[model samples]
Target: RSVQWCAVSQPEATKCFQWQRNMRKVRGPPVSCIKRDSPIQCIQAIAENRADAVTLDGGFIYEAGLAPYKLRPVAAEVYGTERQPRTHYYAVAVVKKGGSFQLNELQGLKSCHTGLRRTAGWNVPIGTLRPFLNWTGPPEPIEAAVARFFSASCVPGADKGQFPNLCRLCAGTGENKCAFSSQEPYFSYSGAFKCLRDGAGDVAFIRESTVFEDLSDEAERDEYELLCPDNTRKPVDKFKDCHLARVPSHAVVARSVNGKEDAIWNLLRQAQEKFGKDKSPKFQLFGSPSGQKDLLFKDSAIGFSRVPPRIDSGLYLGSGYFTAIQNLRKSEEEVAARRARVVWCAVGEQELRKCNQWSGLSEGSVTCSSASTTEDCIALVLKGEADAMSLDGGYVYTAGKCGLVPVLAENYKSQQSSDPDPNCVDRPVEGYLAVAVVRRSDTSLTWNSVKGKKSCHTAVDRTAGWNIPMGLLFNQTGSCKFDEYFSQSCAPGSDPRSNLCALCIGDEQGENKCVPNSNERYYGYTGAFRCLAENAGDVAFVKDVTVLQNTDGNNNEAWAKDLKLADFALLCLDGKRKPVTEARSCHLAMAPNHAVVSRMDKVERLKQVLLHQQAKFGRNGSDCPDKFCLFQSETKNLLFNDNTECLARLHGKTTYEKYLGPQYVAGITNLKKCSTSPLLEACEFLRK
Candidate 1:
């Protein structure tokens, strides 16, 4: 049997025949060829079984994925050099290398776009500049916004009836002027770059590779720079630091059902191994003979990478780009509604009640969604049923890997720093110390001696609770059976009747044993500390604040009422015990603060609403204490931590890996390597 590769043009068909003949010579997967007039036709051919596969751009992938075609991208075109091959490219705004202007200065400048409504070419760039355009939507079209934002543009595919300025800079002539097809000189990536090169426009909205592909000399490429989101310009090679967006590369698409993915992938793998860019020069699979460009596959493609079965077109395009195109497809009313409100996801009944209280106070701007667990809340956010929620370092890592991006983080009160600090929201965040605590009466207890002792924890997967303590143990002992590490313990989230939950005291009614919620008497930081205080366990995994807040007459609860600062001591990693006050030097790890996360589309809005909402109910807000306190829940740590000072702004560290910091993220990774996380497995299951 042979695989039929689809070609969009005659030259492409010739290239495919060459590829087929080359494959036959190599005795690899049998190759056959099919020709079509255009990309959509090729898409149709694959769907109808006239052809088996075709490589398509991200935008076309979206189209091919829709009904009628119902195709899925099985293999992605990898680009970049052999030393650093990549499955995506960055969309950049290129201008002549100089200090003339930055990204913010593009207004009223003549522009060159790859085409109208295209991904990197138009949607991303347009969506990014919308706030500055001053041209409102609905009453006025988005194109009207762009028409007035820039003086003129070579925006191919524009109707040119109501917006002639959109095509004023195109190099095409006569009846073929400003055409959407190759007939126009500025219709795609290279053409857009050409429009800037020929000086028809001041800047070109194109992918970073355009400069490299069109100009062979390093000097020619050096003559251009890219615009950054920070409103600055950087050198061409710095596209990683300054680009509109990272666009996923083209992919080989086939019908979703019976897609022949394994056969397609097998052929791709075998072909690239023998005929790739750096392979034998008999056939240039990733190269076209000078005058020709982008035959069967992209000319400069490095190789092919198998696309994960779970990644559909929507997932492949990325959340920002997906939402960007979706906005262009929807009406202003629909877009505005999506943008206006923020839905907060809460975990468990206690959190749901707290969320309901906040929603009532938010005056319709905020609503609530609830789940039995934090993972369920994360799932809800992934499906767009909820917009935002807070997660600790451990949960943050889990959510981050699942495509949710971090927004604002819960900043706790500073230790001893004076009022030199900036606004709470703008102040730098300080990580809280995750400490191992034991009663002062346990004279023989130390980090080394705590093993096999009854242990108490905040929960099974929280920062200080399970992750920090168990992670360190797993690293040292090379064991994942944490249940076996301790003889008797109360680790909430574990089985109710297991040794892991033996020490947990349920609610007054004795109905919720070992439950990972406030209803469980030994569930959170304060609860874990109470476990050690009441002598239920020999050691407790909690944060330093838990020790201070519940001891020395700080807490008014009956169990904590008469407790003194000397009643507890921190177990240092170096096998010695220190006063709880020495947490700065003796803690297990410094865990990043709990952070809010959502799909990329809601990041900006979610960040904005959180800051606004916090201003009304934060630590020292205009209406806090007297109204509702966002950081207080009777010390149960419901929703946000009780010690939270503000939902501080991130320091340009938006990604989960960056927000969580590499070391802790690595620790979680090491911990998970010992045993699969049921939470992670569930997320992966839902993802597929």
Candidate 2:
């Protein structure tokens, strides 16, 4: 029987399917184009035996589990390039005229509002822009923070006058009116432009440059203003507004295969050359600095942040409290208004056809207004506005206790790594740690002496500032909280308010914020505040090893040098470098040197390397072989140089064992423990 086969859509894909067609030029499978609007339809057609082949788009690649097959793109010649085609979509974030938020610096946006369930709805809050907030503290959980923002009047940073309505996303003046004369409402961003035009969305946070350009025509220009946060804008008359649509800058990806992988890779190399502009015609990018942002991308993917919030009382706690309070009701208006507006701004018809959401907002004046940030933005909350606003946890909790009611629903989850064995050790984590810092001066007391004096107190939240002092001094977790202890100074067994013992209760003397005073009593660190940093009596308690190392490096260098001159003792951090043991006193609280593995290939290669070093290099216990370097050897030829440290080399005569793969084992025989804490602490720089 003659074989009957099928080829799907060969018209546009002739280049990719040429070989298959060539094999049976005269008598082969019939080519056909079967329409498949969705992934399910294609799968359904396959199930019912309606077609032997089907074409699928990128979305269906994963949903229908069709990624296994080797899918190829047709060559550029197949599509003919007489006239370049316009981009079908774009992503954008447009700012209205005279907006307070920095249109150029994406980092300055404290909050944004888009039609709920829209692209910016998710994109702005949780999309590619979340890490910039420095949200590193233990202020409160994100959910709780948001809950408080949406639900009630803000607590710690509550704007009581603007109660109920909390629309930080929208901007407005003191009056209960949106700053923009025209404002719109929207629910989703999938079709933002139409929604905004239909008086549904204020800011259409959608994709599709063509639509925006069309909407921003000169005749309708007075109705709108466009904000370009990328900071790259051009006047429409200076150049064709839609000129940016021609470039294709996506990071085209290709999957790996066995034999086909190499072949496909070679093909892709040609494909890139054919499609992409040459960064440099002849030279490869060895010295070029274009890939500088590659490291940033990697760090973002791995979810790396500077430091944990709970530890620093100033940064985490302080910032969070401030942000949560700011998210509260803007101004009070009883009910939500209807129909937000999008005023058309300047742009030519040519630009409209090429505009997309992500397309740069430059080259056009497109205006829009939304109740998303109106007085009603907060009014909705005050009068039981929208469900809830997303707030930072630590900030919200502290604020909520004071007065604010967060929005009811909150669903922010902590970013967690799912990999079981990441092989990372001594990795820094963001967590709560008491920080003690003080001004540098000749007479200032340092390190361990702060406990007994009247310390100047500071903290982002009440819990952290007071919590650390009590915990450190008394070794108690919660029995005698900071407040209670503050009322009672460090006396053996005195009750704080009214003593059953000898120590005097502090003489607060009618102070509004009654912190411990008088050269003896102190505890003004009030209520659970946000995660912030505070300085201790000439010291700051630090939890992170990284911070500890940094602080040690910054301070105590001169002090350490002075001590070294006074016959203090020292010890090496990792035993690689010699410690100055003759100093007065040196200690190591942490060893900063860490064993890090860069690549598996390096580990594999190290397995075969020789593991040998000489022990007492003189043969037959005799000295002096005249010709060899370091010639106190009876042996004829031995390799020894000035870089060698030979004192502890005689102790490793023990027998060898099995190789423990790429790991640096604990027992390598040259190891020696440091004698004191000061020795270890003083050597952190040496270890690093």
Candidate 3:
């Protein structure tokens, strides 16, 4: 089938039609062009199935991925001709060397912008400077805030009549003053640089290549400086280190679900290979004819590269640009409220109760937010309702892809074989063993015969619980029907109507059944253990700590008081059953430690509060049990795992992909082929 490429303007459509005819002549893959009046209309056309794909600006990518459209970036246009090419551009604040003012000192000074609503020129700079704007938000518009911050400016595509100060520095003829087109002297990248060069504005919001492309000599280019995010200034050529944000180049986007990414890339590859820059005189894939600009794709684009399936628009845009654009629409008051306090998200009633207690002891430093499932908690953090939460490695991957960073990890006691680091905060996590625990009496239930039997798991998105065991099962069987394989299972976070939730026993009152938190009787390590101990299920997906912690007189609970290590056995993948003590050799996969995740903006504050709060109420703290215990939950693993010694630093594993090792990430990638979290989908769309 031919891929339908959407075009916005007649010039672009005219160019696309010519390419369509050429693709047939060359016997390459076919392409069909569809017309829309604007870029947004093209996005709509693609979403409604009227078109297959379209090249979009970074900002438009954000809007196209919203709930109604649900589009994704499938291919990127490379725009470089140097030692290395990139599908991105740097947004920099350029200044003359004579000005001593850095980025932090731009208050009340004149500013020049390429044009209103442009990515590198306006959106990025405004978001970077918002903290200093002092404009509180609506009933006042963001543009009004910009007007008040800059003393006088030439911002083309803005209201030249409404705010005369905005156009006071424009160097255009009377009728053409402050126009959006080149008729205005300060209309784009080079023009904005010229505004700063002519001493009309103190700073010019342009891109990294502007000064180099405009000046004829190296000395002239060297005359300008770039204001960095760190409040320092460097030579213009050092824009890599001194920029507001890296703006992603144009991308060919398709629908996220069942999107024709393969066909699109195939067609794009053939087009670029045959008609790419200077490759053919009959047609040019990335070049526009004279008098036209950026028809079909950017005129300077070198080629098209495939985007990873995981690189949704949100991941592609990155945190800086994502937060920047979001800030432009939010009120300063609203933004400040988020910055001042850390709102910890908790899953289920048990965690919420525990979270509220911590909030009470936090002296206003900590607040509480609640949801029924871990995925809901993730959604809360994404929408800025909650600041942070502790998540298992499996969920952490989803959170990471949705634009959150790992802050602190749950540091458990080190294994006896390894010399434990004395500095818990600086130690790298070694991960726990995900073991399959089964009652010793069930001699028939070895690893080979466990299928088609009842089972217990911590939760659907949990690493030791669902990912490891289920992933290995899928690997062997190549099927995703987990519920059918395990006749009846207590896998919390699955649908309540499915057999996956059938074995789940709720709280004492029989409520909260199938809930994905401690409130459910058959949830987490302890709960999953109880499911096996009571013979509710033939096997339980848990970890080494869970088996040892609840057996051999270690636990005093009513159902666990008489339990012994001899009563249970570990199912090894070798088709044999071994004692629980041999978990190291019988486990499924090494599970990554749980870690706290938050949006980029709240990382610092959340880290500070969590570390300090843990010091006051963590294990061996000065006020642990007497006032509040952050890690204990009356035998329930509420808010955090009971074995957690402290909220330790990741050492260097700041990214979710990094924190979760490559092997585990690959396992998760395999497991997700069957299902994906709704929270992840929503977050990706919202962030984009």
Question: TM-score, each model?
Answer: 0.63, 0.22, 0.71
Please give, for residues 274-307, the per-residue lDDT of candidate 1 as tens digits. 9987687889788877666677788888899877
lDDT of 2 by residue, 1-688 (tens): 1111122222223322332343235342323334443235544444444433332222222223333332221111111122543211233544333334433344423333332212233222323232343333244333233323232211111132342232332333343222211122221222234434544333334333323343546645334344344344332232233121111111111121221223323333432333223333332211112312111011011111111111111111122221222232221121112101112111212112222220223112212111311122222222221212222222222223222332111111111332321221112222223333333331334334444443333221222333234444444332433334332222211233442112322334532222222212222221110001122122222222112222333224332222221121122222221122211122222111111111121222211110110111212111213212221211100111111112111112111111111111221111112111221222221122
Question: Worst ten-residue run, lDDT, model 3?
Answer: 679-688
Rank list by lDDT: 1, 3, 2
lDDT of each: 0.83, 0.25, 0.82
Clashes of each: 0, 120, 1
Which segments of candidate 2 are over 4 A away from where they belong? Answer: 1-90, 95-100, 103-127, 132-190, 205-208, 212-216, 221-688
Among residues 3 or more apart in sequence or in different chains, the pairs in candidate 3 whose N, CA or C atoms overlap within 3 Å are 62-688
Model 3, span 1-688: residue lDDT tens: 9899998767778988998999999999999999877667888898889999999777778878788898999888887773477778888999988768778888789999887767877888888777787777877767777888889998886787677777878888987788765577786777788899899999999878778766879987878899888889898888888888878887899999768888999999999999986899899987777655567887767888777675566656765575567777778777676577899998877788888988889998899999887876776676566879888888899988787889999988876533434477776677899999988887888888888899999988788888888888888888978788899999997888999999898889998899887778888889988998998999999988897888877888989999889888899999988998788788877888899899888888988998888878987676988888888885577888888888888778799877887888888888777866655555444343
Against the hidden true structure, what lDDT does model 1 obtain? 0.83
Top candidate, metric lDDT: 1
Worst 10 residues of 1 by lDDT: 679-688
Query: Candidate 1 vs candidate 2: which has greater lDDT?
Result: 1
Among all windows of ten consecutive residues in candidate 2, which has the lowest summed lDDT?
A: 295-304
